[PDB]
Amino acid sequence: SQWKATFPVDLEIEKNSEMFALRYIKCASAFILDRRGILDEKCFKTRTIDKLLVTAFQSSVPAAKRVSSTFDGLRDAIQQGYLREFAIVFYKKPNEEDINEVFAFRFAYGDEGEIFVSLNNGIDTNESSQELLQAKFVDTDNTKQMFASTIKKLHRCIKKMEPLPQGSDASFRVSYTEKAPKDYTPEGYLLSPMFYTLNQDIRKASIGIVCGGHHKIQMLAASQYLKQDFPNMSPYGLSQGI
């Protein structure tokens, strides 16, 4: 039930920061997929982290194990400093380009100077990239607090959302840093020329940034099911694992 049962401490240390970063995006993903109703409810279990009720995959359920396992290959992607963004996109077949909703997790590595702002795809903006740049690691307890603050905001944001359309489809999509080789492909992902793009008018939410010592992870959302821009108290990659 304590932080330590889920996450590393001493987050200033590179290895602990790396492990935290991956475990964080897996945790938030379970939270999101459960609350937006993408998988059967038996795929999830409620766990406790300090004062907060969060969500984890139930790996004894095949669909949940499949989704959980997709994160395995991202461990090397993060270690090598290759993973720029991990995104959960919701859409309706057959139009995989028409994104109804996305939760994006954008990475910055060890006081990286500045990051390219994509002109033609994704969710990132000058504003969001400035916020990611200005975020700083402070100490482990502070990240415990910021984790809690960010999950609470995620929760409040999802509460403001209308339900997903019946039979929505979901994919995981990743983009890479300039370090990554030209045809880099994490284990469990497929190499793709396509990422995702959003309608100009889609409503957006900035949920928060959580920092390890060597990794900053920014959560940004956009949804056709938010009306307007926005208890749990105790060279791209594609995965269609969901």
Side-chain angles (χ1 to χ4, degrees), residues 1-226 229-242:
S1 200
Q2 299 198 111
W3 174 270
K4 236 198 178 83
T6 299
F7 293 131
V9 295
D10 290 312
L11 294 177
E12 74 194 286
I13 294 174
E14 189 170 351
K15 180 67 176 194
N16 292 341
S17 188
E18 288 173 357
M19 288 189 300
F20 174 63
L22 184 55
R23 291 177 190 183
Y24 172 69
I25 60 169
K26 181 181 288 204
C27 170
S29 296
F31 191 92
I32 289 162
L33 290 174
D34 173 51
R35 278 282 287 290
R36 298 300 283 148
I38 301 302
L39 297 170
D40 195 287
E41 294 187 37
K42 73 174 70 181
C43 290
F44 308 101
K45 52 182 182 175
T46 295
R47 57 171 321 97
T48 305
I49 298 179
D50 294 339
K51 296 178 188 311
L52 275 198
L53 296 181
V54 302
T55 307
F57 297 107
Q58 173 47 264
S59 51
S60 289
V61 178
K65 184 176 181 57
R66 185 169 62 245
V67 179
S68 176
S69 288
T70 67
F71 289 89
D72 292 352
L74 299 186
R75 182 165 44 255
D76 188 57
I78 290 168
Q79 290 180 25
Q80 288 203 68
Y82 289 174
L83 184 63
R84 176 62 74 207
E85 181 175 329
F86 165 79
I88 310 175
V89 298
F90 302 141
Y91 66 101
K92 205 71 164 99
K93 289 182 174 179
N95 294 81
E96 77 275 7
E97 82 280 18
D98 182 17
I99 304 307
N100 291 323
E101 178 164 298
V102 55
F103 295 83
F105 298 80
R106 292 197 41 89
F107 283 65
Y109 296 85
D111 88 286
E112 255 184 300
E114 172 137 15
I115 296 173
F116 173 62
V117 171
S118 187
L119 299 182
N120 280 117
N121 61 23
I123 193 164
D124 59 306
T125 65
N126 285 310
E127 180 157 65
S128 74
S129 83
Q130 272 313 122
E131 298 172 337
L132 180 55
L133 226 74
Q134 294 164 4
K136 288 296 180 303
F137 183 75
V138 178
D139 56 59
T140 298
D141 188 70
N142 182 66
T143 290
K144 296 188 188 181
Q145 295 299 116
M146 185 59 87
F147 170 81
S149 177
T150 299
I151 297 297
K152 286 171 180 185
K153 185 150 182 190
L154 174 56
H155 168 73
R156 290 195 304 271
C157 177
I158 289 173
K159 285 174 84 173
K160 297 282 284 231
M161 294 178 156
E162 305 172 324
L164 278 180
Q166 42 285 356
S168 283
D169 303 280
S171 286
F172 293 164
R173 290 183 176 280
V174 293
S175 69
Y176 310 123
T177 70
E178 293 307 324
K179 300 186 74 242
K182 198 202 151 280
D183 262 21
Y184 179 67
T185 306
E187 296 292 317
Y189 279 70
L190 296 168
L191 175 69
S192 179
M194 186 176 92
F195 195 38
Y196 68 90
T197 64
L198 304 174
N199 291 336
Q200 163 70 336
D201 71 347
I202 195 168
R203 283 147 301 240
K204 289 192 177 186
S206 176
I207 306 301
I209 303 164
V210 298
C211 300
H214 298 263
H215 304 84
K216 306 184 275 195
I217 309 93
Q218 173 183 57
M219 197 195 315
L220 305 169
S223 183
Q224 289 290 340
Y225 310 110
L226 279 173
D229 283 343
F230 174 92
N232 63 11
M233 305 324 300
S234 182
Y236 304 100
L238 167 71
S239 174
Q240 318 188 291
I242 307 78

